[PDB]
């Protein structure tokens, strides 16, 4: 399937080989996608359109920590392990991205998974699992216990490097972004800092924004697209014909950055979001987490910092910052393009942004 670039959307900078967070060596991603039932929602019975996405910063077999820092755009949402990140500049274990209703289940399941994987002497380090959410309430039975521990184990165990599936998968399965179908998106940038190159990888779970604000490559596009407004049981549910017939951003880099420097990286995410036109809804939980895969902390050991960067080194830091902004901008658009039309709970129907129209618009704007 085409990604944003394939439909003629231009972006600045140089993407990595996979144009994904896994361009950062050693990062693994797994999805479990839960899609079952149709028709009217009954709490505890579905329909279910949900799941979980796992990111292993250093792979599923690592017991070590990664240096980390976060940023909050708008904090109406949950992301666990973040007080830890704020205090000691690192976290242990995987990142889980999921639906709001799944947070506690995922949190405990990650603990159960550790008991079966980790040496008992190291169990203390698995007590603060990192779990984050956006709300799949239009398409999913949020409270209905559709996600199981087995689902979580499968994502943890199945995670891998290489190409990352985008769209209606894992934590993104039941999401809605810019009044089009939401979900998972990813992008990367290879950046030049003097004689050195670094990779900045971004993955998003997008459930934010309004169609009328959306910009793609600077084009305010919602009004250029015809139709494709959401429907409920046959009736247009938004837009001019209404009535008629949160955002999680994960940044990986192999740059050997210190925790406070990774906070700076995280704070660049908002600028990439800003490029695409949204204004951070009052109830939209929008968060960024950044980590380094080269600045690593062996469990109970000496931190490994292979090289060290000056915060005032504009050449290096700006290269890295611009990388975050650009990869974030593109990951957001890649999400929209990868997500297909879906019908879910209560016959709610949300359209993937139409490929034919997007390509036509891009061709006209960028001949």
């Amino acid at each position: 399937g085409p990604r944003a670039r394939d439909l003629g959307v231009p972006f600045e900078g140089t993407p990595g080989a996979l144009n994904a967070i896994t361009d950062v060596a050693g990062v693994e991603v797994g999805h479990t996608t839960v899609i079952s039932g149709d028709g009217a929602m009954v709490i505890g019975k579905g329909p279910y359109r949900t799941g979980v996405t796992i990111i292993h910063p250093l792979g599923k077999t690592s017991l070590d920590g990664v240096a980390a820092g976060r940023a909050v755009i708008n904090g109406t949402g949950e992301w666990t392990g973040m007080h830890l990140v704020d205090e000691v500049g690192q976290f242990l274990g995987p990142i889980a991205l999921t639906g709001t209703g799944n947070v506690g289940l995922v949190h405990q399941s990650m603990m159960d998974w550790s008991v079966g994987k980790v040496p008992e002497e190291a169990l203390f380090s698995r007590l603060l699992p990192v779990v984050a959410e956006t709300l799949d309430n239009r398409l999913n039975d949020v409270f209905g216990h559709g996600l199981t521990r087995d689902h979580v184990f499968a994502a943890l165990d199945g995670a891998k490097g290489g190409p990352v599936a985008e769209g209606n998968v894992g934590g993104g399965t039941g999401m809605i972004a810019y009044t089009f179908k939401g979900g998972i998106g990813t992008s990367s940038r290879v950046v030049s800092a003097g004689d050195t190159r670094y990779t900045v990888g971004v993955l998003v779970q997008a459930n934010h924004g309004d169609r009328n604000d959306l910009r793609i490559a600077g084009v305010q596009i919602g009004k250029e697209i015809k139709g494709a407004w959401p429907e409920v049981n046959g009736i247009v549910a938004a837009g001019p014909d209404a009535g008629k017939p949160s955002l999680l951003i994960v940044i990986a880099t192999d740059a050997p950055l210190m925790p406070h420097q990774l906070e700076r990286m995280a704070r660049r995410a908002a600028l990439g979001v800003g490029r695409n036109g949204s204004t951070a809804g009052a109830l939209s939980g929008e968060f960024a987490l950044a980590f380094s895969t080269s600045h690593v902390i062996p469990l109970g050991g000496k931190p490994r910092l292979p090289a060290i960067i000056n915060d005032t080194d504009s050449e290096t830091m700006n290269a890295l910052f611009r990388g975050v902004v650009q990869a974030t901008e593109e990951a957001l658009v890649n999400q929209l393009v990868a997500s297909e039309t879906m019908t879910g709970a209560n016959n709610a129907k949300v359209y993937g942004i139409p490929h034919d129209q997007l390509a036509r618009i891009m061709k006209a704007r960028f001949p």
Copy 2:
């Protein structure tokens, strides 16, 4: 049973009638205490010494929010719903305080409880439950699933006003503080802010500190007490004769404070902690959350702020601040006194601070 004052420990200020967080009208507290098994710990088979403590800011039937603000002393621990508090200055639902291994279970159980209590239209407001932890790893099978959804429901439903049980109860059941038995403690102050008297109530779940640092009423008491060091299988496990035969602070007030003013309140907890001598362990998750029961936010309506206070009004603010410092100091000592000797997982034995010795020391120091 005697509380700290009853053993001759002096404190400054005037406590409320109950000398507890429930001196703040409408606050309800519940505990479920889980104690089963003895001897060698096998993960999933106990022994269990754990539980959960519930605090309903406005009572169990409230759908409304309370103005709130938080502070971090040392952030190596979990407390959910805090991004929400940082962002919008309020939280919905109960505060749960529990052991580290129970966070996910408690988080989902609270959602489940809401489904059976609140109108479907208010379910959105129940998606970010507030759950905090300290670690009962010495006395409890942390990973062993000792806490059940029923335990959580019982605490949610059984919560009430009036006297608050202290010691080895609810979330505090298997905790250890200042190398003595840890647990739950509570105290309050009624403070004169001009011609208006507010109540400041504090509850702690204590699992922090070293005996060598402990100060009670300014007395460095660890070396004055003889014996009572922890044991394993009858062998002293800490202190000089070793070998021979986190902190959660919840502040309630009826002062009509704005969210940023409640952050100031929460930041006062550290001074109260400082009075008692600990230095915040590198891995001690020490947190404070402050809320108002008068500044309330009707769900989906207009915030109710019955009066308004100027931050530069020293008379009012300092009365409130001093209240927090004093009530926190006393709550910590009250905890120690209420907690009794316990033997738990792996035959670990932790002594309650000896009442006879404490009373003897206080009598000598304060005739």
Copy 3:
């Protein structure tokens, strides 16, 4: 001359009557602009291209505080009075925006001005002046004491409502933005929340960004413009032909917001900046301060909060948030268009963004 809209740049939303921060009633703005000398720079002798911009939140005769909250995009710069804003949610006195070299002089001058204007009994409230900077180092003798106490008095005393001068004036006089001439810009939005209208006004002092990242109305315009690169003594200083022949954002609103709510407003500034393409340089001090003119604190008195807004009231908050994003986006373009080509210290020459070319590009893009 022309402002951005006059050159055919489209923006979203409805500007206030003045399309300026002074659309918020009672706000006063004053500039002192210092331009003297030409040729090679000698420290302490000029050339000078600097100044100061004063914003009185409630007018120059007010002794009262305004509710306030801030946000940091990248904190490599100075802005005094901000610890106060963080702590007590308000500040007293005017905001001064100036060149880095002028900070201390302006800070003390504001105290001096207070001694002469304020009742003796109220002098305590004047001890924490609000002063912020960006660096005019290419065009100005930064260290050379070009700004005087008299210059500051003149801006304090000459401040007024009505139209605000933009471009090479006040604190913006010697600034550079997006490799074109920087300086002062302003814009406003009147926003609708049901039957209620509010105004959000923004003023920027812009000294940030690179030409190659600049977006105006979503158009990446740096490569579309021919020439107009900076020069030093007749030699192109940047861009392809090189070698051959920080950001301060002030947000005012009449919305009756609490301090933590104004922090949310301030955090929206970054999204507006993001729209225009910059990525926050490592050494670019980018800050936002937001205040309410309706939520005011009589000195030594009871805060006046005429109405109260729920943070979860999306209709109201989103209206205000969108206002910040749009007004920030426009104030940045308004700055560029207002700023004229300038030659300063060491014969550095920076071009105002070319009006003829910009208009042509906008016409071609937006027929």
Copy 4:
């Protein structure tokens, strides 16, 4: 003259050789003390009781940065350069501690001093001087321009290693703490972190707290001391018999800590303050700044991090934290003992805590 230990006050831990911040190698301290005039205050004509204290983290000839992090206890005061510290984890140049009315003068004077001392290529790094304040309003003509640029230069140039003068000197000259004479205090700890011993040094400028709250070595001493309350014109101005005849903490360490780790150190200061009984007044600007003298950043070069420490290494981190708490606690008492009775502006008279009574009390409590 005796310090606190010499009067019989016990403290925990091992001080460095000097028991002062200069036990951390390379740190230099300088004071300029300004004392002139008696009787009634007229703004601009004294009497003056003020000054400035300079701390050079790496000595007066250093152009390099030190890694640093800060904490706020209560933010109603000024400390410049802190946005920089928050963002990039270091600051350049000296720390100045002074009276509130002197901030702007000191800020500009430090720039002027740099112009004379620093190479031209390094001037950019001198643009964000670090200046902090407490308010000497009872004893000093705050607005009266008593401090001159020459005073600042003398303290910058006269700074040295070795014993540090305490009491009514430099920035502390006109201060008041716990209703006794305030001033400068300092202490250090050498702390055992495994097989390595680090030094933690602390200097305070104390202008905070109330006599009734003061604890010295856990003894609530205000009521044990007879007389010595402040007077105006021979009449008691505070306390029971009235009418009858802010805090700055600077932490230095040679531990090679990263910036986020120094924030942790700074957050420990509050516990040390807590030990001595104060509750952080609403208008008391109470701040801490911590820097490392081993983790240094050559100007425009590669950061030098000689060794690296794990945040979860309890043995090392707790040793450092305990050092901060104990050194802060002792610095505060050392201040009181060093500070002598002073009469200043408006015939305000503030007593040094009486040495004879203190020694007698300590002897009775600690036989």
